[PDB]
């Protein structure tokens, strides 16, 4: 089962001769490929929808809302911004010039990515995106400690930055202008942050899918594809994610009970042929 | 010197609004800032406040008319939430606060049992003009449901038994008329046959006994009401006919 | 003006909580207020054992650094913040 | 724009942590060390006993010395490096070679 015609039409019949979610999930897997992933919700409108965001988009909010920027709606968008992540905590170690000066010296928006922000930390920040040394925002990262690291470099080489880890030989205060990643733009809201493209070779990005290779089976199986190619398809590819729409609570449950249905066997019908 | 108006995130939202409309700034020990560094530029300005045992009162505040619209149109965003009822009635309360004014119903009743049916008309009617601005009227006395059923009565389906599901519909729309009619103890069959000979908004009035314009006798339903009524009970109703087993638990 | 006795001097606060000297630093949240000052008038001297009146090693209307500990009493002069303290809460001297 | 320290008091700057030269070569990190070296700037004039008057301090300037970092010493920020100040009695030794 290949063409999206086909795929649409295995889809279709497990929905119970609905074409909608057919043609719908044809389009999904059209647009991210056979690995991209779907998801489905409970709807607002009567109507299903489709949505598709491309590049890297990861789930976590900024935790100081003046970071905002010239986008309303509470949007932070930044020029080439820089990344960096140290795995620890930052109160204390609001310090840390000889790195934001550098920044300072370069005189660039950053992005910013740590494990979590104090509000001590907190307070200095805000006076900087007020008093223009340098525009500055930060944001939360991603995930569990352990799953979150995993994913975390992954986003280093995406943008050509080196990850300093405070549980390895490298400081929090030791940082170089240099040992930033670079992105095109960058938009942040409550919920989402979002990287549009970061600079990085095609080299890097390949090779370390090339490695991930030999993690997506091991001994694991399924469970932790799940979250392994969450990752992946959010690397490289794209993700795609469906809001299926209903008029009542009632039919939400049969309307998705049969759009998940239709969804694992188009994977199936993908794989193993229909 | 006044109380912040309410517990946390609250009142913190509410100074805010209040801030930009007057044009001073929040002092916050969240931000860079304390109270015992501040400026001047800090403080709002307004050309009068009264304040008495139970109230506050600001009168005409000076705050740009771009900031104050700044707050509102941010609260756009805050209008959409998932939050539904009890969302809407403080959201807008802070936003009618800033630009427009608010007003306040007080039924009135010899017992508590006549209050809670005076207050119940009263909030069935408030959400219903409510509803009826935005979304438009139609004629009352089910009378618009009864019309789209006459005007969709040459539609057919994929199939035989299709068209039954049509056909089911447009005669249970008829429902709510007919049942008006029989409230009044009054032949449902007569009323519907002698309102389906006729066109447009010619209708029956149940309070008057007796025929004529529902629009010009000032029998309105808000559209979106009828609307709604209508969606809902079709998908209940048209899931719930396709029912070939029930489990449930023992007694 | 007033003058202070013995060996004990009386110094004006210097700009606190705002670390914007040094460095490209900024301002920062967590504080540690006015470790320097520019005094203002000091005393005769201190006597020691039998001492009598030793001169003390700071004149007057120099910038300084200093650790401040309870021996410095915050009072108000002249419509002015003032801290009070011995010689020996005096650091270093420093000049431009 | 340099700094004079008051009588007893030496103002030194800190020597930064070594990665580790013993059990060469293995370096050790990332962490504090304890400071067997510091370098120095200026020199108080001395501390007073009994009309001792001021017996000079020991050490000189430009001498690398070792030092207890207690609550006796202060941090300060000068121009570019910040650098510590501190009295002669928590001057332990002077390395010389
Ligand atoms: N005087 C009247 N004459 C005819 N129909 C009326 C009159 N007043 C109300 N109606 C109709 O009866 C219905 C009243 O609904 P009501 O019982 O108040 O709440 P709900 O809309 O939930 O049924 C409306 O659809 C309206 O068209
Ligand atoms: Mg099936």
């Given at each position: 089962?290949?063409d999206?015609?086909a795929?649409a039409?295995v ?5 119970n001769?609905?074409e ?9 897997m059209?647009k ?13 409108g009567?109507?299903?929808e489709?949505?598709v965001?491309?590049?890297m988009q990861?789930?976590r909010?900024?935790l100081?809302?003046?970071?905002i920027?010239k986008?309303e709606?509470?949007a932070?968008e930044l020029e ?5 992540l ?8 609001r310090?840390?010039?000889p790195?934001?000066?550098a ?17 001590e930390?907190?307070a ?7 008093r223009g040394?340098?525009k500055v925002?930060?944001?939360?990262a991603p995930?569990?400690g352990?799953r979150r690291?995993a994913?975390l470099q992954?986003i280093?080489?995406?943008?050509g ?6 549980e ?6 030791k ?7 670079q ?11 979002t990287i ?21 089976e091991?001994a ?10 969450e990752?992946?398809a ?8 469906i ?5 009542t609570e ?25 | 010197?006044v109380?912040?108006?309410?517990f ?6 509410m100074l805010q ?5 007057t ?7 969240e ?5 015992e560094?501040?400026?001047?530029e ?15 009162t ?5 705050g740009?008319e771009?900031?104050?619209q ?8 805050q209008?959409?939430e998932a ?11 802070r936003?009618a606060?800033?630009?427009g ?9 010899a ?13 069935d ?9 935005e ?9 618009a449901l009864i019309?789209?059923?006459?005007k ?11 068209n039954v599901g ?6 249970a729309?008829?429902?709510?008329l007919?049942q ?7 032949e ?5 046959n002698?309102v ?10 149940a309070?008057?006994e007796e ?5 010009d ?11 709604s ?15 070939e087993?029930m489990v449930?638990?023992?007694? | ?8 001097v ?7 909580e705002?670390?914007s000297?040094g460095?490209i630093?900024?301002?920062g949240?967590?504080?540690a207020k ?7 008038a000091v005393?005769?001297?201190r006597?020691?054992?039998?001492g009598?009146?030793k001169?003390?090693?700071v004149?007057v209307?120099?910038?300084?650094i200093?650790?401040?500990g309870?021996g410095?009493?915050?009072?108000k ?9 011995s ?6 001297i420093?000049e431009?």
């Amino acid at each position: 089962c290949s063409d999206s015609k086909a795929i649409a039409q295995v889809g279709t019949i497990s929905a119970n001769s609905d074409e909608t979610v057919g043609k719908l999930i044809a389009e999904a897997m059209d647009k991210v490929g056979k690995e991209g992933v779907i998801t489905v919700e409970d709807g607002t409108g009567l109507q299903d929808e489709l949505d598709v965001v491309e590049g890297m988009q990861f789930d976590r909010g900024y935790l100081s809302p003046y970071f905002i920027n010239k986008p309303e709606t509470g949007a932070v968008e930044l020029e080439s911004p820089f990344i960096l992540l140290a795995d620890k905590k930052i109160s204390n170690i609001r310090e840390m010039l000889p790195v934001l000066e550098a920044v300072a010296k370069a005189g660039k928006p950053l992005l910013i990515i740590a494990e979590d922000v104090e509000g001590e930390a907190l307070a200095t920040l805000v006076v900087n995106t007020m008093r223009g040394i340098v525009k500055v925002a930060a944001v939360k990262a991603p995930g569990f400690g352990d799953r979150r690291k995993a994913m975390l470099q992954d986003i280093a080489t995406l943008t050509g930055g080196t990850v300093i880890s405070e549980e390895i030989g490298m400081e929090l205060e030791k940082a170089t202008l240099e040992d930033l990643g670079q992105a095109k733009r960058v938009v942040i809201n409550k919920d989402t942050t979002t990287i549009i493209d970061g600079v990085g070779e095609e080299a890097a990005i390949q090779g370390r899918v090339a490695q991930i290779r030999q993690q997506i089976e091991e001994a694991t199986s399924d469970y932790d594809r799940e979250k392994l190619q969450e990752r992946v398809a959010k690397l490289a590819g794209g993700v795609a994610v469906i809001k299926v729409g209903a008029a009542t609570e009632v039919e939400m449950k049969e309307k998705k009970a049969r759009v998940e249905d239709a969804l694992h066997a188009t994977r199936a019908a993908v794989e193993e042929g229909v | 010197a006044v109380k912040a108006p309410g517990f946390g995130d609250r009142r913190k939202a509410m100074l805010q609004d209040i801030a930009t409309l007057t044009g001073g700034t929040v002092i916050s020990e969240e931000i860079g800032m304390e109270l015992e560094k501040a400026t001047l530029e800090d403080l709002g300005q307004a050309k009068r406040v009264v304040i008495n045992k139970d109230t506050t009162t600001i009168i005409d505040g000076v705050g740009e008319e771009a900031a104050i619209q700044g707050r509102v149109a941010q609260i756009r965003q805050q209008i959409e939430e998932a939050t539904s009822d009890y969302d809407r009635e403080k959201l807008q309360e802070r936003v009618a606060k800033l630009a427009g004014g608010v007003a306040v119903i007080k039924v009135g009743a010899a017992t508590e049992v006549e209050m809670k049916e005076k207050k119940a008309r009263v909030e069935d009617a408030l959400h219903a003009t409510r509803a009826a601005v935005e979304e438009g009227v139609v004629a009352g006395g089910g009378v618009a449901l009864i019309r789209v059923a006459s005007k969709l009565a040459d539609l057919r389906g994929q199939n035989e038994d299709q068209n039954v599901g049509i056909k089911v519909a447009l005669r249970a729309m008829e429902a709510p008329l007919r049942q008006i009619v029989l409230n009044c103890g009054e032949e449902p069959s007569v009323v519907a046959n002698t309102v389906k000979g006729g066109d447009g908004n010619y209708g029956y009035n149940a309070a008057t006994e007796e025929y004529g314009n529902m629009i010009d006798m000032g029998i309105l339903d808000p559209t979106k009401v009828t609307r709604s009524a209508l969606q809902y009970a079709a998908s209940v109703a048209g899931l719930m006919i396709t029912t070939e087993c029930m489990v449930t638990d023992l007694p | 003006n007033i003058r202070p006795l013995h060996d004990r001097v009386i110094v004006k606060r210097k700009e606190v909580e705002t670390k914007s000297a040094g460095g490209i630093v900024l301002t920062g949240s967590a504080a540690a207020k006015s470790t320097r000052g520019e005094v203002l008038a000091v005393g005769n001297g201190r006597i020691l054992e039998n001492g009598e009146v030793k001169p003390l090693d700071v004149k007057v209307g120099d910038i300084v650094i200093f650790n401040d500990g309870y021996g410095v009493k915050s009072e108000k002069i002249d419509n002015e913040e003032v801290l009070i303290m011995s010689e020996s809460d005096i650091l270093a001297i420093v000049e431009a």
